[PDB]
Amino acid sequence: MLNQELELSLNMAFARAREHRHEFMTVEHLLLALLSNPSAREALEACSVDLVALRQELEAFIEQTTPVLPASEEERDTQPTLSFQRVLQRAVFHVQSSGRNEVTGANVLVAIFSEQESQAAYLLRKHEVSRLDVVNFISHGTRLENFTTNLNQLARVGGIDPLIGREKELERAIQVLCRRRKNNPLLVGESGVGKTAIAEGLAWRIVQGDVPEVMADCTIYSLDIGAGTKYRGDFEKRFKALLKQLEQDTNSILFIDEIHTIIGAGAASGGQVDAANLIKPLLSSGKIRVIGSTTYQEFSNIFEKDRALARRFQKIDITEPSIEETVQIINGLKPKYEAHHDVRYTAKAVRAAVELAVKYINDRHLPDKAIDVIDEAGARARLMPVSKRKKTVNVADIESVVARIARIPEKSVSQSDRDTLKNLGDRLKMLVFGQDKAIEALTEAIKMARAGLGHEHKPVGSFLFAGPTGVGKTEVTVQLSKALGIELLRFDMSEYMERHTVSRLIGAPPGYVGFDQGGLLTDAVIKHPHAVLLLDEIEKAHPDVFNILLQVMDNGTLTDNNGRKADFRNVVLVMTTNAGVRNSTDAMEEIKKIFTPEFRNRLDNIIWFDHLSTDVIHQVVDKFIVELQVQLDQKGVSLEVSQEARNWLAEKGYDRAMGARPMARVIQDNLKKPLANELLFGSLVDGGQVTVALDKEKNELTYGFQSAQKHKAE
Numbered sequence: 001m002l003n004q005e006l007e008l009s010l011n012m013a014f015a016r017a018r019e020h021r022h023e024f025m026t027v028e029h030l031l032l033a034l035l036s037n038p039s040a041r042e043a044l045e046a047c048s049v050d051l052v053a054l055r056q057e058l059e060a061f062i063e064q065t066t067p068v069l070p071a072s073e074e075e076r077d078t079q080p081t082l083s084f085q086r087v088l089q090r091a092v093f094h095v096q097s098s099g100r101n102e103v104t105g106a107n108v109l110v111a112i113f114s115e116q117e118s119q120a121a122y123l124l125r126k127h128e129v130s131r132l133d134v135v136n137f138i139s140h141g142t143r144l145e146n147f148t149t150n151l152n153q154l155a156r157v158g159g160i161d162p163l164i165g166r167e168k169e170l171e172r173a174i175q176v177l178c179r180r181r182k183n184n185p186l187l188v189g190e191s192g193v194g195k196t197a198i199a200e201g202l203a204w205r206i207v208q209g210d211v212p213e214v215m216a217d218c219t220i221y222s223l224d225i226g227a228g229t230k231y232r233g234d235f236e237k238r239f240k241a242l243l244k245q246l247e248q249d250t251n252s253i254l255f256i257d258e259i260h261t262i263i264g265a266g267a268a269s270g271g272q273v274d275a276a277n278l279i280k281p282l283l284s285s286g287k288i289r290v291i292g293s294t295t296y297q298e299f300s301n302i303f304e305k306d307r308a309l310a311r312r313f314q315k316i317d318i319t320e321p322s323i324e325e326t327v328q329i330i331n332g333l334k335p336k337y338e339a340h341h342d343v344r345y346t347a348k349a350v351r352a353a354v355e356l357a358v359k360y361i362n363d364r365h366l367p368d369k370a371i372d373v374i375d376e377a378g379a380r381a382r383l384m385p386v387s388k389r390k391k392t393v394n395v396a397d398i399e400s401v402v403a404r405i406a407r408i409p410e411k412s413v414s415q416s417d418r419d420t421l422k423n424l425g426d427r428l429k430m431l432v433f434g435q436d437k438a439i440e441a442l443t444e445a446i447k448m449a450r451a452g453l454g455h456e457h458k459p460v461g462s463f464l465f466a467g468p469t470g471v472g473k474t475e476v477t478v479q480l481s482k483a484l485g486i487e488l489l490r491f492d493m494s495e496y497m498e499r500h501t502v503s504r505l506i507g508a509p510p511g512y513v514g515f516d517q518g519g520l521l522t523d524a525v526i527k528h529p530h531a532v533l534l535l536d537e538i539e540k541a542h543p544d545v546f547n548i549l550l551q552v553m554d555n556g557t558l559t560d561n562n563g564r565k566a567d568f569r570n571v572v573l574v575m576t577t578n579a580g581v582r583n584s585t586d587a588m589e590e591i592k593k594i595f596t597p598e599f600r601n602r603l604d605n606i607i608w609f610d611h612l613s614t615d616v617i618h619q620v621v622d623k624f625i626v627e628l629q630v631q632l633d634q635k636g637v638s639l640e641v642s643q644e645a646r647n648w649l650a651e652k653g654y655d656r657a658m659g660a661r662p663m664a665r666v667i668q669d670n671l672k673k674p675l676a677n678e679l680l681f682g683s684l685v686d687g688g689q690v691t692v693a694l695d696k697e698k699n700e701l702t703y704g705f706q707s708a709q710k711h712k713a714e
């Protein structure tokens, strides 16, 4: 009773149903099958139907609504719906009654129209295909500039990707826009949640006539945004001309995506908020409606408490879609992604994209991150030259995709990083002396973190460098940053005490915590994610800084503005202290008294620094002499410093209270200054020799000079 062609179309659609593993074969599956069927295809072509725009829509509906049965043991195979059988019987009854031999696809197509409540019938009516057109086919023949504006125009073609679900939110927006006062919807939600999607989706509903009667003549023009808009062009005169052009007496809605840029954040010149607040009630011969978009926090403080327009807008909470609602969203977009990637995603991969992104991609939200994993996974197939189809198993693909987004970044094996880290303790020991323990405890902690051992939610290392003044605490961290090849961010905590400096001259506390949070600390760590953060004199810092520090050491993040701006994941935090000296006896309790157990227990290590021995002080002196020798040897000048003069430099360049802090000046005043004259207009111009000695019963340095081409004669 049925054609060979139609019987094939049925079998091929039955085939797709036990591969996608559908429990139901529906009327929508039937129309989908009919797109392959020559008679139904020619009928639809006759009415000027874009087969693809119908293809994508049927496919999207089918995947969102058909139950999936890959579970276990219990009896399930594809079962046609009562409705599906009803359409075929309607087609056979009509054909037999018409005097025709067999049922063709075009006859089944006529039978679908009679399923009054079906989606298949609904789509045929949307594509403007009437039942009469198929009957007659069978019988006879045996304003703004340039950005992403005018969403109504983008909807009539195919620029806007479809909006799935969210009826309550659109309904609420339409109702808000329909009010007499406070007519302006304000979509509030996290990034990726689907705010732009709702605005764009509204423009489609206006075109489709699914927003009737008084909102038919509406057009949604989208403005340009995305935190302060004034570069060049004078914002005040272009906007005034725009709002007036939007007003000739029309029902024009203006979508301002990321509305916190113009208003709330505080601009430089006028116009901005001041001009947008103007047209909201009645300050002309007309009125405009605005759809805004912002995040939870930027609505909370900068919009509602600071107040720029808050009351005139109606807030609509746009929540993150749940797992199953996101599965429906992905299922509704899946066919267009599959067409583009030439690949098929299994229902298990779809659920996995959603569920794995929820668990592991915490920095992002719902639809957005799940859609990016799905797009990324399909693109990934191309890299295997062809694009390997994907049978019934894709979870593993999704797992690699999610793993790459969620984590990974680190090179650390058999060479470059290996040699540096294996010699880090030796490289530092050749610049900082008498503190082998400190260096060893520090490098042990770096290597450990570099081996992938440690936490991902915490800094590379959090250390408390404790010890006396001038023993190598600052020098070690400066060198640590030079040996690791990373930036050095330095902050003095004595400049971050809240109100201690006044009677002198300096005084600036509206910042401090505001200096660190608002800008400085956050800005520096965003600019240089891989760095060593040195905080001098940590004991002098205000408790607000300590809470901020307690968060860094726990969360690995710090928040000034959202999207989790400051990332301390790749930072070596170093805090130096002069607190409990290793006029105080120290063996235990001293450092413990000054810093709370809560702050101390978040440290990776309290790295202790000892006093400098007599031998160490001499090594420091030699280091200064060798640096000078390096400079002098290049100019053909040889510097020799005697033992007695080395003892004299050691004596003068080391205070027990100040450490080796006075050494640089002592070396400068006694070894560098006395050679300037001779190197410029004396015996050392063409090279030579300097001998520095000591005159004992005088305790002052002796300076001998000798010159020559090289060392010719004496």
Ligand SMILES: Nc1ncnc2c1ncn2[C@@H]1O[C@H](COP(=O)(O)OP(=O)(O)O)[C@@H](O)[C@H]1O
Pocket: 161, 162, 163, 164, 165, 166, 189, 190, 191, 192, 193, 194, 195, 196, 197, 198, 329, 333, 367, 368, 371
């Ligand atoms: N309900 C939806 N149906 C289909 N796609 C959606 C839906 N909601 C969001 N998306 C998609 O997810 C992404 C995030 O949506 P978007 O509107 O940009 O979120 P937001 O504007 O809040 O940052 C966009 O690619 C959008 O196409």
Ligand SMILES: Nc1ncnc2c1ncn2[C@@H]1O[C@H](COP(=O)(O)OP(=O)(O)O)[C@@H](O)[C@H]1O
Pocket: 431, 432, 433, 434, 435, 468, 469, 470, 471, 472, 473, 474, 475, 476, 576, 612, 620, 659, 660, 661, 662, 663, 664
């Ligand atoms: N342990 C040391 N090894 C090598 N040089 C040192 C040592 N200690 C102090 N110096 C010299 O004296 C200066 C002061 O040391 P620094 O690390 O700044 O002191 P602090 O431990 O108080 O932070 C250094 O810049 C360095 O020139």
Ligand SMILES: [Mg+2]
Pocket: 492, 493, 494, 495, 536, 537
């Ligand atoms: Mg200081």
Ligand SMILES: [Mg+2]
Pocket: 469, 470, 473, 474, 537, 576, 577, 578
């Ligand atoms: Mg110090």
